[PDB]
């Protein structure tokens, strides 16, 4: 707890050595915290601001004076649905990972610098991303695999004899 | 690390641990190691002097050459730089860009002024004398071996009375007038 | 070591920066210029097709 | 039996079906023949068991465990008690060989501790906040008064840092040769210690950084503010990569398991949280601890340790997903379905300043006011180090060899995402069915260039218009066609 | 269309009238409302505002014609003086524009006015004697003078301006 | 006179507004005097 | 810093760690208020009682003034009012608060000082040295 114990010559008039320490330790004056800012509200506000900076940000930049006598009175008959185009926002609202989790705000703006470490399109043999990830899912260096499995995972597909003539096959 | 081979130096010809590009390339430690400055980060002061005088020199020159503020601060800067004595002839005006360097701003130091006054064999024991505290300039004793003796104090940087080196100098000359303490 | 890092190059040959290091040569200037104009001719004839 | 530790998480073309069968068969075979290595693992871990019901595991102190422990470990159980400089602070090296201690007054000592080889002591006259090794015994950084210094192995001041306007939370990302600083101003900055370059200056915008840990598994940096926000960062984005609401008020400590999965976090409102990281689920809370625990650390086996100032409390196996391994404080009502402290030590009157588990031995170093003390704890050290990366039996030759190999395999600074398995994929343009094109006078020069540009614009407009064209009552029926 | 969001609030809420962008004959028509619109010359000022904008000045320049009502807008042609066959016409507009608009911007910053110039017809807006100063400098330059000489002449005219 | 070759970042209304608001020799030269005074004081 | 209550019962200890703590002078009534007001962004550099000691102001480094009061949601020490100084890059360098006339003098780190009538937080007088 706090305050606990100093017995100097100048300090600790009372609170002497209690070697019995039974039936005389029932104070237990527990200090309490405070209601500092109620940071759940601040966190929900920051989460709501990031969610508002999401969801494709769709804009009603309508034609503001085109055709229908805008400005200074004269509220005409037509309802202004002229330009309801939607910019391509970063993530939709129901495809983030913050809708499930509580008190967790992740933000999925994509990195222009880590454009550089992925292939733009899929490779030729492995026909989609599932087969390509399942291809390179396992490493081959000796820090992650055993010695015999490592010497099996590396060898060329055409292991040639080192210094003599390679004849054409004639088996059957 | 290990004086890397060709195939490792070509892969990493960029890394070096003991010097980076913030010390201006071993210059501070090199000139401090050759010129005995005891307090650290003082070639920052020397090269900041030799760059700052040229900085405010061009900052004063690009001013329109008619206002008397220019003449005032030019004359104050030149006579302040002359009275401490890094410029020998005061008549040089715009060619302070090239001559006042480390080899001149360190030439006002009390060890090299001592060695040019032939008060010592070399700097290696001139710093020992003026660190032992035998050498005054003007009336008062000076102990820090980074002191810049000015122009008007070079004439009076002499040994104190009541010191072993003054005593043995007067003993070898055999003129030890022992009334005034030595 | 040689077969291991060769297998690594073979496995990672689709990454863009090690592709643009492993690809380029010093092709002589005659072959480079003439292959460049052959490429723009082939792109033009594909556009007309 | 052990393959969960070694695990790494319908087609038309016949040759591709055979290739996929070959590669996932090779995956299964390599995972099994990697999991069959812990038969050849050199020794077994340690434990203290209750072996009764009255013999609780936390009514055991240093006297009896040091009596029935080995002589070499008992002599490892050091106490480098120093009093003339302030409340000390610990950092063991990456391998468990060298120790770096720091007093708040001026003291910084980098020294072997299993050998009496004090190799760099230096006093100063300014408050040294914390310190950490860079890669070796060779270079160690101290977060001093208002400039971070890095030092050679004997004590020569290698570099003041012109940046890092102050510093109080500083550590190292080892494989990238990165030094990470968080200060009392709202900054977090990365400085590579190989090239010497600064890498990024991430403005935190959340007040002073109250605590910080490092994830080992993906090298993200875990800040904890005075908002109760635990943020995770990396030098890719200037924004924080994720945020968390751990506690209320400020969070004084945060500590990451070496497998990157679990995060312990202790606030200032007498609260502890246990978090998953890879799912960001608050696993279980702990309330009712009497004083706000100022420093928590976590072992290499899951044996965490709170440090409440006078007390240090070690809980074994308090990171499962169940509701049973919630770390409690006392067995009440005859309840064996709790988690009491696995052990605990109570120092006299000196507040403990920071923890740190020794990497590859069974002891927990703790630094406090009057100095250092190590605690013999049986399961809180990984027994079987792997000698290709960390090695407590180095020589000069293999130390320089590991220096040159890791400087050759310096991972570039961009490659630290939230998940470092994500550098092999395609770049979010997958097209699982891939469309492979099979199944779909200077005024006058400028004026002619504008003419050709306008013709290209018109041809583009006409091709898109043709594409849209290709992809798309009685009396009026009689009065049609006009 | 790209400047329509900044044009109409100084035609509706600052200045009191109302607008329509007619796509019938591709024009702009302006009414004044009898119920609450003050300033009986505001219709003419807003008409001249959109007239300067559609004539070729930028929209901040046209707002500068809208506020501070004593700025008028003169227009003349290349074809009136020296009859300017097409090669010489290219020399003329290149000589007035200078290089990267620098002589035109020199006349702009000198004579406190702003010009724009089509392929054969130029327009100057500003105050009236500044229009006349810019017009005599432009007609001297289109008669064909050394740009250093017209720079010195504009130094003298800027000294008249101060 | 200097005859500023750049376009502007103003309007005619802003030009005449500055002419209306202006209605102690040169403020850029005053700032130059002040910074060279501070730098000379640091050098001395 | 420290501030004393009007009577000799309570002290407010404001620290560089973001807590401002209220501490009682004698252990016999220690269960009254040993609480720890958190909440400011960076360092809290002052904490003052009011005249009626039911309101506790706490002033921060960046320029926040927090008014702690014992209101409801047993029920303890919420924050009923927040004020801001809005100096641009001039943090709070020193403070005091005379309670008998409700006067809070705050001097910033750029030679400026302002001074306020605090419970309504009106700027009485602002100047610079």
UniProtKB/Swiss-Prot annotation, chain B:
It holds the Pfam family Ribosomal_S4. One of its GO terms (cellular component) is Mpp10 complex. Disulfide bonds: none annotated. The keyword GTP-binding does not apply. Residues 108-174 form the S4 RNA-binding domain. InterPro entries: Ribosomal_uS4 (IPR022801), Ribosomal_uS4_N (IPR001912), S4_RNA-bd (IPR002942), S4_RNA-bd_sf (IPR036986). It is found in: Nucleus, Nucleolus. One of its GO terms (biological process) is ribosomal small subunit biogenesis. Keywords: Nucleus, Ribonucleoprotein, Ribosome biogenesis, RNA-binding, rRNA processing, rRNA-binding. It comes from the Eukaryota. The keyword rRNA processing applies. One of its GO terms (molecular function) is rRNA binding. Belongs to the universal ribosomal protein uS4 family. Required for the early cleavages at sites A0, A1 and A2 during 18S ribosomal pre-RNA processing. Component of a heterotrimeric complex containing IMP3, IMP4 and MPP10. Interacts with MPP10. Component of the ribosomal small subunit (SSU) processome composed of at least 40 protein subunits and snoRNA U3. PANTHER family: 30S 40S RIBOSOMAL PROTEIN, U3 SMALL NUCLEOLAR RIBONUCLEOPROTEIN PROTEIN IMP3. This is U3 small nucleolar ribonucleoprotein protein IMP3. It comes from Saccharomyces cerevisiae (strain ATCC 204508 / S288c) (Baker's yeast). The gene is IMP3.
From Swiss-Prot, chain C:
Signal peptide: none annotated. It is found in: Nucleus, Nucleolus. Belongs to the WD repeat DCAF13/WDSOF1 family. Required for ribosomal RNA processing. Interacts with snoRNA U3. Interacts with NOP1 and MPP10. Component of the ribosomal small subunit (SSU) processome composed of at least 40 protein subunits and snoRNA U3. Present with 6620 molecules/cell in log phase SD medium. This is Protein SOF1. It comes from Saccharomyces cerevisiae (strain ATCC 204508 / S288c) (Baker's yeast).
From Swiss-Prot, chain F:
Belongs to the MPP10 family. This is U3 small nucleolar RNA-associated protein MPP10. Component of a heterotrimeric complex containing IMP3, IMP4 and MPP10. Interacts with snoRNA U3. Component of the ribosomal small subunit (SSU) processome composed of at least 40 protein subunits and snoRNA U3. Interacts with the SSU processome subunits EMG1, IMP3, IMP4, KRR1, NOC4/UTP19, NOP1, RPS4A, RPS4B, RPS6A, RPS6B, RPS7A, RPS7B, RPS9A, RPS9B, RPS14A, RPS14B, UTP1-UTP18, UTP20-UTP22 and UTP25. Involved in nucleolar processing of pre-18S ribosomal RNA. Required for the early cleavages at sites A0, A1 and A2 during 18S ribosomal pre-RNA processing. It comes from Saccharomyces cerevisiae (strain ATCC 204508 / S288c). The gene is MPP10. It is found in: Nucleus, Nucleolus.
From Swiss-Prot, chain G:
Transmembrane segments: none annotated. It is found in: Nucleus, Nucleolus. Required for bud-site selection and cell separation. Also involved in nucleolar processing of pre-18S ribosomal RNA. Present with 16700 molecules/cell in log phase SD medium. Belongs to the WD repeat PWP2 family. Interacts with snoRNA U3. Interacts with MPP10. Component of the ribosomal small subunit (SSU) processome composed of at least 40 protein subunits and snoRNA U3. This is Periodic tryptophan protein 2. It comes from Saccharomyces cerevisiae (strain ATCC 204508 / S288c) (Baker's yeast).
């Amino acid at each position: 707890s706090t305050r606990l114990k100093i017995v100097d010559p100048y300090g600790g008039s009372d609170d002497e050595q209690g070697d019995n320490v039974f039936m005389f330790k029932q104070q237990d004056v527990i200090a309490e915290a405070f209601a500092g800012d109620d940071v759940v509200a601040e966190f929900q506000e920051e989460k709501k601001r990031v969610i508002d900076d999401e969801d494709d940000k769709e804009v009603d930049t309508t034609l503001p004076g085109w055709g229908e006598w805008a400005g200074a009175g004269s509220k005409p008959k037509n309802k202004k649905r002229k330009f309801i185009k939607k910019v391509k926002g970063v993530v939709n609202k129901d495809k983030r990972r913050d809708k499930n989790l509580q008190n967790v705000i992740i933000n999925e703006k994509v990195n222009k610098k880590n454009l550089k470490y992925q292939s733009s399109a899929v490779p030729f043999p492995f026909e989609n991303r599932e087969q390509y990830e399942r291809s390179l899912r396992m490493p081959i260096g000796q820090e992650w695999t055993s010695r015999a499995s490592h010497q099996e995972l590396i060898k060329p597909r055409i292991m040639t004899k080192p210094g003599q003539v390679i004849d054409p096959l004639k088996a059957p | 690390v290990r004086k890397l081979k060709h195939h490792e130096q070509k892969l990493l010809k960029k890394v070096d641990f003991l010097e980076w590009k913030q010390d201006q390339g071993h210059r501070d430690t090199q000139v401090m190691r050759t010129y005995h400055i005891q307090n650290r980060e003082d070639y920052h002061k020397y090269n900041r002097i030799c760059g700052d005088i040229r900085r405010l020199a061009n900052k004063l020159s690009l001013l329109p050459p008619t206002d008397p503020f220019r003449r005032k601060h030019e004359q104050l800067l030149l006579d302040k730089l002359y009275a401490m004595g890094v410029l020998t002839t005061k008549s040089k005006i715009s060619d302070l860009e090239n001559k006042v360097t480390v080899s001149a701003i360190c030439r006002r130091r009390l060890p090299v002024i001592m060695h040019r006054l032939k008060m010592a064999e070399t700097i290696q024991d001139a710093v020992k004398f003026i660190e032992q505290g035998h050498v005054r300039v003007g009336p008062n004793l000076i102990n820090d071996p980074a002191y810049l003796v000015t122009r008007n104090m070079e004439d009076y940087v002499t040994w104190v009375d009541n010191s072993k080196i003054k005593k043995t100098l007067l003993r070898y000359r055999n003129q030890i007038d022992d009334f005034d303490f030595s | 070591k040689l077969e291991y890092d060769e297998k690594l190059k073979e496995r990672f040959r689709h990454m863009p920066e090690i592709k643009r290091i492993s690809r380029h040569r010093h092709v002589p200037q005659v072959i480079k210029k003439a292959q460049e104009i052959k490429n723009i001719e082939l792109s033009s004839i594909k556009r007309r097709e | 039996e052990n393959q969960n530790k070694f695990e790494r998480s319908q087609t038309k073309d016949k040759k591709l079906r055979a290739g996929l069968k070959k590669i996932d068969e090779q995956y299964k075979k390599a995972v099994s023949s990697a999991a069959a290595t812990d038969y050849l693992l050199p020794e077994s871990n340690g434990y203290l068991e209750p072996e009764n019901e009255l013999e609780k595991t936390f009514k055991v102190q240093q006297s009896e465990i040091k009596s029935s422990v080995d002589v070499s470990t008992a002599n490892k159980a050091l106490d480098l008690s120093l009093k003339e400089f302030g409340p000390y602070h610990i950092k063991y090296a990456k391998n468990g060989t060298h120790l770096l201690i720091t007093g708040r007054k001026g003291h910084v000592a980098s020294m072997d501790w299993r050998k009496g080889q004090l190799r760099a002591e230096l006093f100063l006259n300014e408050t040294c906040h914390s310190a950490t090794y860079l890669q070796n015994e060779q270079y160690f950084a101290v977060a001093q008064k208002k400039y971070t210094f890095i030092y050679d192995h004997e004590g020569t001041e290698l570099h003041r840092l012109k940046q890092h306007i102050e510093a109080r939370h500083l550590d190292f990302l080892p494989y990238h040769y990165l030094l990470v600083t968080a200060g009392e101003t709202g900054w977090l900055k990365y400085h590579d210690v190989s090239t010497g370059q600064l890498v990024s200056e991430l403005r935190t915008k959340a007040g002073p950084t109250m605590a910080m840990a490092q994830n080992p598994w993906n090298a993200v940096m875990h800040l904890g503010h005075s908002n109760g926000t635990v943020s995770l960062w990396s030098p890719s984005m200037p924004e924080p990569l994720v945020k968390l609401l751990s506690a209320r008020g400020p969070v004084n400590s945060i500590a990451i398991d070496r497998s990157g999965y679990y995060m312990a976090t202790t606030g200032a409102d007498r609260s502890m949280k246990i978090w998953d990281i890879r799912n960001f689920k608050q696993l279980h809370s702990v309330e009712s601890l009497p004083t706000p625990g100022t420093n928590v650390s976590i072992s290499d086996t899951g044996l965490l340790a709170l440090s409440r100032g006078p007390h240090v409390t070690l809980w074994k196996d308090a990171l499962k997903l169940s509701g049973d391994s919630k770390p409690c404080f006392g067995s009440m009502g005859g309840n064996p379905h709790r988690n009491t402290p696995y052990m605990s030590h109570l120092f006299a009157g000196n507040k403990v300043e920071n923890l740190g588990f020794v990497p590859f031995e069974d002891l927990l170093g703790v630094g406090h006011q009057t100095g250092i003390t190590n605690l013999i704890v049986p399961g809180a050290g990984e027994a079987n180090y792997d000698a290709l990366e960390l090695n407590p039996f180095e020589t000069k030759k293999q130390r320089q060899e590991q220096e040159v190999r890791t400087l050759l395999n310096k991972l570039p600074a961009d490659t630290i995402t939230l998940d470092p398995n994500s550098i092999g994929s395609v770049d979010k343009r997958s097209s699982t069915i891939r469309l492979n094109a099979k199944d779909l006078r200077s005024f006058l020069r400028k004026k002619t260039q504008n003419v050709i540009d306008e013709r290209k614009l018109r041809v583009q407009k006409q091709l898109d218009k043709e594409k849209n064209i290709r992809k798309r009552d009685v009396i009026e029926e009689a009065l049609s066609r006009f | 269309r790209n400047s329509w969001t900044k044009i109409y609030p100084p035609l509706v809420e600052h200045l009191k009238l109302q607008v329509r962008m007619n796509l019938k004959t591709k024009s702009v028509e302006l009414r004044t409302n009898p119920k609450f619109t003050t300033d009986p010359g505001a219709l003419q000022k807003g008409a001249d505002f959109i007239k300067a904008f559609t004539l070729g000045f930028d929209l901040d320049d046209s707002i500068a014609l809208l506020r501070l009502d004593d700025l008028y807008i003169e227009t003349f042609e290349v074809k009136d003086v020296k009859t300017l066959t097409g090669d010489h016409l290219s020399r003329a507009i290149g000589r007035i524009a200078g290089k990267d608009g620098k002589t035109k911007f020199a006349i702009e910053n000198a004579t406190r006015t702003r010009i724009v110039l089509a392929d054969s017809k130029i327009h100057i807006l500003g105050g009236f004697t500044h229009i006349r100063m810019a017009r005599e400098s432009v007609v001297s330059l289109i008669l064909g003078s050394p740009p250093g000489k017209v720079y010195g002449n504009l130094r003298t005219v800027a000294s008249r301006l101060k | 006179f200097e005859l500023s070759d750049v376009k502007s970042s103003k309007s005619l209304a802003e030009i005449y507004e500055d002419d209306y608001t202006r209605a102690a020799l040169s403020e850029e030269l005053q700032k130059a005097h002040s910074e060279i005074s501070e730098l000379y004081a640091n050098l001395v | 810093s420290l501030t004393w209550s009007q009577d000799s019962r309570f002290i407010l200890t404001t620290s560089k760690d973001l807590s401002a703590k209220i501490w009682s002078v004698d252990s016999e009534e220690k269960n009254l208020a040993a609480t720890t007001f958190n909440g400011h962004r960076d360092y809290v550099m002052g904490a003052f009682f009011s005249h009626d000691q039911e309101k506790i102001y706490t002033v921060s480094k960046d320029g926040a003034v927090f008014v702690w009061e014992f209101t409801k949601r047993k029920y303890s020490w919420r924050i009923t009012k927040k004020h801001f100084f809005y100096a641009n890059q001039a943090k709070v360098k020193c403070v005091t608060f005379h309670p008998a006339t409700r006067l809070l003098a705050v001097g910033f780190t750029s030679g400026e000082f302002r001074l306020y009538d605090l419970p309504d937080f009106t700027l009485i007088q602002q100047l610079s040295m």
